[PDB]
């Protein structure tokens, strides 16, 4: 499950990490509410 | 601005802060840098891609639509037909370009509102212990290491502790 | 002393949307509703093509004209397509009856199995069934019919009554076309169908008329004084339609028998078909978009878009953005 909302939460949170990554980065997850950090995790290619 | 707080009272952001929406510059003794609110970032973000969600889910998806076939004598049901088309459109194209316009307007001082709650959940947490000389600046009277600092941007505090450091210092100049 | 201050975002984006008390305001985040993208092509939906009419119109293809030999084994399509280039029509000159209502119906219809309603050779051995062509139909230099319906005429010098009747078996609805024949001149009702006042009889549970052959002097049209009607029914399961004539009658050859199914439809357009499959389709092209609009095309086949006019659909997510000198 994929929606376009939720590929709202998502850029906005990449736009939040870095090129060399500055994380643990699950930076990105905790504002995706929803799916998890593992529903994430491959959905950045 | 609308609740004042940006292009406000505080003129510009930070490039700086690349780890949300919203966060503190804090300077002191160690040093100096920024730090992000994971709390009313979160908050707005599932917030306003709800409002984003919300518009769209009033969007079922267009179905099957295809022209109609008439000939010269149906001249009417043919117009007719062309009006209800025209019709159906000017009205979506009307409620989908004003409702944009309308959003976006409260989404930019949706943030605005959020800048200022946050400038005033420090002030009120601070009090005595610093001043204000706009701009976002409250300039601490007492000392304060990061932890401390940290404390302010957790909430967690407890309030007289840094005090009696603060209060004498406020007097001779 | 020691400063804590409050503050917020910026970022390099040169994104621009629009509000109701400023425009150009730039902004940290956006989104595009609209959809300005398609592939060019005609697809395939859920496994399907389309139906490809090419040079033909529905009507070509239903009576089989010569020129729409392509189209007889086409059984499922998930859609119809016509061209600009299609006039290949019905090639005798005349009326054909609730022609849009008939258009309207094929769009209801995913699939037909078609079937010989009345076999040429069994069929009429009292009538002549080989000379049944015209110069207004010609395939190959030579003068020809339709494929689909067959052409009656006097066998010597005799055109007994004829009747004919067909009950439907199939279980579906059964598409039955045919046609009336209204030649120039009494010498030319004669010489075809030689009874000088004909008639043609049509009916089923819906269907009953009694049409007369209208003879007259007329403007020629692909070189023909005379004019031919072409009717249609719908068979409902279990009916029987009977013909009846003394002359005139273009009678069913082939018919249909009918598979009815949603969300289909009769588009034009010129766009090449390809072996993409998608879930929403125009005119000017394909569509992969999880956007609710789109300005490409008012026409859709699937589940799309919306349709706007816009040229610009932009709505703001994150905060407005200083350039900081
Ligand atoms: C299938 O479709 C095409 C239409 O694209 C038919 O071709 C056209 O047929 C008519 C025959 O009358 C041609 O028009 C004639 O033009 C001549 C002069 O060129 C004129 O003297 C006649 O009065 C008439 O206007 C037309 O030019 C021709 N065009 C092409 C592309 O060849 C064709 O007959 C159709 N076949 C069937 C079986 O319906």
């Given amino acids: 499950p994929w929606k376009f909302s939720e590929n709202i939460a998502f850029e906005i949170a990449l736009s939040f990490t870095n090129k060399d990554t500055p994380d643990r980065w699950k930076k990105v997850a905790q504002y995706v509410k929803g799916r998890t950090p593992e529903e994430v995790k491959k959905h950045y290619e | 601005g609308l609740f004042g707080a940006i292009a406000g009272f505080i003129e510009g952001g930070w490039t700086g802060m690349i780890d949300g929406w919203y966060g503190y510059h804090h300077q002191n003794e160690q040093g100096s840098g920024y730090a992000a609110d994971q709390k009313s970032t979160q908050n707005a973000i599932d917030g306003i891609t709800n409002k984003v969600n919300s518009v769209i889910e009033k969007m079922n998806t267009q179905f099957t639509a295809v022209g109609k076939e008439f000939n010269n004598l149906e001249r009417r049901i043919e117009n007719l037909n062309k009006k209800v088309d025209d019709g159906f459109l000017d009205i979506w194209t009307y409620n989908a370009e004003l409702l944009v316009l309308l959003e976006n307007e409260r989404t930019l001082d949706f943030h605005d509102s959020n800048v200022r709650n946050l400038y005033e959940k420090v002030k009120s947490q601070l009090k005595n212990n610093a001043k204000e000389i706009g701009n976002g600046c409250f300039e601490f009277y007492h000392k304060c290491d990061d932890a401390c600092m940290e404390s302010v941007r957790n909430g967690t505090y407890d309030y007289p502790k840094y005090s009696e450091e603060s209060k004498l210092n406020r007097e001779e100049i | 002393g020691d400063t804590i201050c409050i503050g917020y975002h910026a970022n390099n984006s040169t994104d621009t949307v629009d509000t109701v008390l400023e425009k150009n305001v730039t902004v940290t985040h956006s989104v595009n509703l609209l959809e300005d993208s398609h592939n060019g092509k005609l697809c395939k939906l859920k496994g399907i093509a389309p139906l490809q009419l090419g040079k033909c119109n529905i009507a070509g293809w239903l009576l089989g004209n010569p020129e729409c030999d392509l189209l007889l084994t086409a ?224 026409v859709t086949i699937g589940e799309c878009p919306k349709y706007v006019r816009s040229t610009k659909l932009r709505m703001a997510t994150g905060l407005r953005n200083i350039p900081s000198i």
């Fill in chain 3, 75 to 298: 059984s499922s399509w998930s859609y119809i397509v016509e061209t600009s280039n299609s006039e290949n029509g019905t090639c005798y000159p005349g009326d054909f009856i609730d022609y849009e209502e008939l258009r309207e119906q094929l769009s209801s219809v995913s699939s037909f199995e078609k079937f010989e309603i009345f076999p040429k050779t069994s069929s009429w051995p009292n009538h002549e069934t080989t000379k049944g062509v015209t110069a207004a139909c010609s395939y190959a230099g030579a003068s020809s019919f339709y494929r689909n319906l067959l052409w009656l005429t006097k066998k010597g010098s005799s055109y007994p009554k004829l009747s004919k009747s067909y009950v439907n078996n199939k279980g579906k609805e059964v598409l039955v076309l045919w046609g009336v024949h209204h030649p120039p001149t009494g010498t030319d009702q004669q010489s075809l169908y030689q009874n000088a006042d004909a008639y043609v009889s049509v009916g089923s549970s819906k269907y009953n008329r009694r049409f007369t052959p209208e003879i007259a002097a007329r403007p020629k049209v692909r070189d023909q004084a005379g004019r031919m009607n072409y009717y249609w029914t719908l068979l409902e399961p279990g009916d029987t339609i009977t013909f009846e004539a003394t002359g005139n009658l273009i009678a069913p050859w082939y018919a249909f028998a009918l598979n009815r199914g949603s969300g289909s439809g009769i588009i034009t357009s010129d766009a090449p078909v390809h072996d993409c499959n998608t879930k929403c389709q125009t005119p000017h092209g394909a569509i992969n978009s999880s956007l609710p609009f789109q300005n490409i095309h008012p």
